[PDB]
Design a protein around this ligand. Structure first.
Ligand SMILES: *Cc1c(COP(=O)(O)O)cnc(C)c1O
Ligand SMILES: *Cc1c(COP(=O)(O)O)cnc(C)c1O
Ligand SMILES: N[C@@H](CCCC[NH3+])C(=O)O
Ligand SMILES: N[C@@H](CCCC[NH3+])C(=O)O
Lengths: 442, 439
């Protein structure tokens, strides 16, 4: 219905977003159309307080901000790093450039954890030389090369080892296997993970402080995380009984969900965490080991909901799909260059007109970008009012995770601007790219 | 076999690529490993003469360079625009920034054709002010807005109209329908396209010179293009009989294929063009209309084969699934999204030596922290490929760099060209400072 389209699902949209009585959407009191006019479109708008409130939710649920690592892969800038730093969270990075951005912002290295399946010697030296607190080891070669690097610096590097527990956790199910056919870490089932823990134990310049797993995506309950934790704690028990070694930490990774569409439920992090951490304590007590400090690495569930992408609506057309059915195509000014996720993953977003209330009869609609490719589709098939037209401002919710980070210059499109909002004012976070930026590489 | 892996399939690889006796692959005389050492990895290497020779192939087949439009969307830099200019080709752009690149390179605007499904007023004004030769109209709104813009400038803008003929041409089939459920252009089956042609003709500041269609991807024969052309020429006949209007040009778009893997055959442009062009002339005679000048818009088939992407091999690991051997390289889905996005299959080779190991099921992955960052999904390659080897993927000259991202803050790779035993930097590698500059 037209009424349903003119709603604003509060569990999807940023926490400080409101539908005003004239149809305008504000975020932190700032009207979205005014941002679109000031900064241009497409535009990412970041509800700063939303982001910080997620940090806090997580910190309370997991027994302190230092147990929560923000997964920078979702979205990292100097501003984001500072927000994380101020909130007391740890920061996970996965490349030399994510480390660069974090160090540029003055994020303390002792609070950084480093990931990556193919860390080279330059990265590893940078990590050791800047005193990064943890490195998560992904392979035997890395374990040997980091031990080398660390010896060269006269340092002992605290490490976790990434293990594959054979659990893939999703929204409605988890999938359990003995073996995981993917590039990361060491197999639990085969003995490889234990052999890596022995290698880290034998190493003169590494200090093993726990194991890590990352098993989830769009997860809203603890059942898969629990089974992963039980499987990995089985290895803790073998490490204790066979090596005499106690591990103080257990990093159970990320994958906490957010609601992308109105029909989905938001995450109840308090409930999930309570379930998970109660289970981990019970499991530890059963095996006769110290209950480890549980670390988590949410990306999506810290950054996603805060951010929306505003577009200007452009061309509209009715397209007959057969003799009897019509699909209404609405073009927006960006496309798969600022949100590749519909095309790549089949991701479904919530779209709203943020500049007015719509009044037209609802009709089957497809929202497309401005790229010269037929798969540049943002919203594949929804029923939206037929009056959405050129000059309307149309926004997609929950674009603060992965969307900007995966942005391209396809068709020489420029990366959009990113602005934060708080207390009725806006601040530029990242400037829009220009033609000159594109040409600068020549 | 090991012997098969140590080959270099000439019909996939750039035309001036050669496997030397020590296993090292050179392109235009320049050893790929030297380039990797000099410019770092990942590295795009463009065989300049390959690119030019494709242009020349296309120009001969379609009756002169001016009838062949390079589809900039495949890859555009000022250097590429200069090559196209020099080869006598037309240039197709699809955004104000593709226009900007072309104009910064001094590419003649009269030789530019502008595409896009959602052209804004600023782009349209730029096209008209700079004197771009053709605009391809995509919607009723664009037709009315361009006529207004062109009036504002005191110019008459030559246009084509994009039509949907209900044909999708692929490698092993074509698909025919009465309607195409996509965003571009005007339907032929409803009469919408006819009404657009009438409106453009009637417009005081638009000059209708033809219709356009783009129907293909990875096409190696003319059968789909022919039926598209017949369906569009039927509309030409209706325009002649119902409006009295003759159309001198017919733009049949792109979609010409390249061979990505060894098993695939290369495109025979001369044969496909001869088949299509002969058929167009025959259809025009049968309908009693002027045979139009046929325009084509290859992207992939001009730029793709010229270019390889060189990686440095890093981490190797055996993973029990039977065992799959995982080889990591230093780039990934940030420099080639096509395997993840489309399922695209590439040819990988070690370019720094001959391999000697027994062949095993292998997967080549990138360095990003996502399990889907896979570049080669399932191939049987020698088990001795190892850290420090240079491993290249062929035919990366179309779409790969244009679709590149800074995921995990990875920097865009450098692009170098090679010719006559020398290398020239085309695009420098991005740096951390480039990323930080937006702050
Ligand atoms: C992806 C990832 C996380 C977070 O994923 P989200 O779904 O965004 O929470 C944490 N740790 C690692 C190693 C990852 O790869
Ligand atoms: C994609 C495209 C071409 C060329 O596609 P290729 O497969 O690279 O040849 C030409 N014209 C238009 C409008 C296109 O969208
Ligand atoms: N990179 C895509 C898009 C180009 C074709 C459509 N313009 C491909 O693999 O074909
Ligand atoms: N689905 C996310 C990636 C999650 C990363 C998991 N290791 C995306 O858009 O890339």
């Amino acid at each position: 219905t037209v009424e349903n389209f003119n709603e604003l699902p509060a569990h999807v949209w940023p926490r400080n977003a409101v539908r005003q009585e004239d149809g305008v959407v504000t975020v932190a009191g700032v009207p979205l159309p005014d941002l679109a006019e000031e900064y241009g479109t497409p535009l990412f708008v970041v509800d700063e307080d939303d982001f910080r409130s997620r940090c806090r939710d997580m910190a309370t649920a997991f027994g302190g901000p230092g147990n929560v690592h923000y997964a920078s892969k979702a979205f990292l800038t100097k501003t984001i790093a500072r927000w994380v730093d101020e909130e007391g969270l740890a920061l996970d990075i996965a490349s030399i450039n994510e480390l660069g951005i974090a160090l540029a912002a003055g994020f303390p290295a002792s609070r950084i954890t480093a990931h990556g399946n193919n860390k080279g010697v330059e990265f590893l030296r940078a990590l050791v030389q800047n005193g990064v607190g943890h490195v998560v080891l992904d392979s035997a070669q890395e374990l040997e090369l980091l031990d080398y690097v660390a010896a060269g610096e006269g340092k002992i590097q605290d490490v976790l080892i990434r293990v594959k527990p054979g659990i893939e956790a999703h929204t409605h199910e988890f999938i359990a296997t003995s073996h995981e056919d993917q590039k990361f870490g060491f197999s639990l089932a085969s003995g490889s993970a234990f052999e890596a823990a022995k290698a880290a134990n034998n190493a003169e310049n590494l200090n093993l402080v726990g194991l890590h797993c990352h098993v989830g995506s769009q997860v809203f309950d603890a059942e898969g995380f629990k089974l992963a934790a039980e499987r990995v704690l089985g290895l803790y028990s073998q490490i204790h009984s066979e090596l005499g070694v106690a591990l103080p930490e257990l990093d159970l990774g990320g994958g906490y969900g957010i609601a992308y569409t109105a029909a989905e439920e938001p995450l109840n992090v308090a409930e999930v965490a309570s379930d998970l951490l109660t289970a981990v304590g019970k499991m530890a007590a059963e095996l006769g080991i110290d209950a480890p400090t549980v670390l988590v690495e949410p990306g999506r569930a810290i950054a996603g909901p805060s951010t929306v992408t505003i577009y200007e609506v452009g061309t509209t057309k009715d397209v007959h799909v057969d003799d009897d059915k019509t699909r209404r195509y609405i073009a927006v000014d960006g496309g798969m260059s600022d949100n590749i996720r519909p095309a790549l993953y089949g991701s479904e977003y919530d779209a709203r007109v943020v500049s007015r209330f719509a009044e037209g009869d609802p009709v089957s609609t497809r929202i497309v970008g401005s790229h010269c490719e037929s798969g540049d589709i943002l919203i594949n098939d929804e029923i939206y009012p037929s009056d959405i037209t050129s000059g309307d401002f149309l926004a997609l919710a929950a674009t603060g995770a992965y969307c900007y980070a995966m942005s391209s210059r396809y068709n020489a499109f420029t990366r959009p601007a990113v602005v934060s909002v708080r207390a009725g004012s806006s601040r530029l976070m990242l400037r829009r790219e220009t033609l000159d930026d594109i040409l600068s590489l020549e």
